[PDB]
Design a protein around this ligand. Structure first.
Ligand SMILES: Nc1ncnc2c1ncn2[C@@H]1O[C@H](COP(=O)(O)OP(=O)(O)NP(=O)(O)O)[C@@H](O)[C@H]1O
Ligand SMILES: [Mg+2]
Ligand SMILES: [Mg+2]
Ligand SMILES: [Mg+2]
Length: 311
């Protein structure tokens, strides 16, 4: 329809959306405006503290923003924990046992869990992390100190003592998928992940080789084990969040890119450890990705004249 849409960029430092800001121009149908110009169709907003209250007011403007208000209820450690312990649906065998500790909480239920394991004489190594410096120990009282020492509401999570290692180099790793949730709440998983292998033994590795280390050194395949369970976790996590961030009755549209962080243990079991709301990408994939975003979440709303899986 030879029409030209408009957009503002409120986050100059996002490499994922500094990229998108381009691919748009590439279609010859988009024009970037002044960061403060309110006549935009699409707003590539800021990582945190985004002005959602001013969306869908400008007369006649249908607006889309690249963040779901309230999506931090899944992205912040402490929140993610409450969310899984709240909704009855969350059968969460894939989520490390976790407790929120306020410096000044669940440190009482934590101690109970800790002591129970101590008497049953089983793995009792935990890791204390900050919701937004990490400690890994077996001493509760000590872990709790660390928390109180530096006020910042930490989370005490059960540490995976039996992690699937790699080689050469026998190093620990973690996988990270990219999930795109559009304005109608369709979920799309980019066919490519990325691993963050460790330097010292127990570099960034892609699904290219890793799909091999699962066969040329193991039994099953990349799909028949990991990629299978990963989909289930994504689906339930976002399904439990929908009610609290659905834009069905809001005066504007919303879409968002999430970066899920997983881990695999000895028995090839996949655990969820974190979900990042403003994930960057590999310098390599930054292209086939940012184009799926425009295709699936932007152009789907503002029409112009495989790679993704729909969970
Ligand atoms: N439950 C767990 N069991 C085993 N290892 C874990 C667990 N949780 C986290 N880790 C490891 O701890 C590392 C850092 O934890 P993470 O929760 O990602 O912290 P962060 O605050 O986002 N910081 P960053 O190190 O920049 O990613 C991860 O890359 C994992 O290798
Ligand atoms: Mg929103
Ligand atoms: Mg996004
Ligand atoms: Mg992290």
């Amino acid at each position: 329809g030879s029409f030209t849409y408009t957009f503002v960029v409120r986050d100059e430092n996002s490499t994922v959306y500094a990229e998108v800001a381009k691919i748009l121009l590439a279609s010859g149908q988009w024009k970037r405006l002044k960061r403060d110009n309110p006549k935009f169709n699409l707003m590539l907003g800021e990582r945190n503290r985004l002005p959602f209250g001013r969306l869908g007011h400008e007369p006649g403007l249908v607006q889309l923003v690249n963040y779901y208000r309230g999506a931090d209820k899944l992205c912040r450690k402490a929140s993610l924990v409450k969310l899984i312990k709240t909704s009855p649906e969350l059968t969460c065998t894939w989520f490390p046992e976790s407790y929120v500790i306020y410096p000044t909480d669940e440190r009482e239920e934590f101690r109970s869990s800790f002591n129970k394991k101590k008497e049953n004489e089983e793995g009792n190594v935990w890791i204390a992390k900050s919701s937004s410096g990490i400690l890994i120990s077996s001493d509760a009282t000590e872990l709790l100190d660390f928390i109180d020492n530096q006020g910042q509401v930490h989370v005490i999570q059960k540490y995976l003592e039996s992690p699937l290692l790699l080689e050469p180099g026998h190093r620990k790793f973690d996988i990270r998928s990219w999930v795109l949730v559009d304005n109608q709440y369709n979920i799309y998983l980019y066919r490519e992940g990325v691993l963050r292998t460790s330097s010292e033994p127990y570099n960034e590795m892609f699904f290219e080789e890793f799909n091999q280390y699962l066969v040329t050194s193991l039994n099953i395949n990349l799909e028949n084990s990991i990629l299978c369970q990963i989909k289930e976790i994504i689906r339930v996590c976002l399904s439990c969040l929908e009610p609290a961030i659905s834009t069905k009755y809001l005066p504007y549209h919303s879409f968002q890119l999430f970066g899920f962080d997983f881990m695999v243990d000895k028995n090839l079991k996949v655990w969820l450890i974190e979900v990042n709301g403003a994930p960057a990408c590999a310098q390599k994939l930054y292209a086939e990705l940012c184009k799926g975003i425009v295709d699936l979440a932007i152009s789907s709303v503002f029409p112009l004249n495989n790679v993704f899986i729909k969970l």
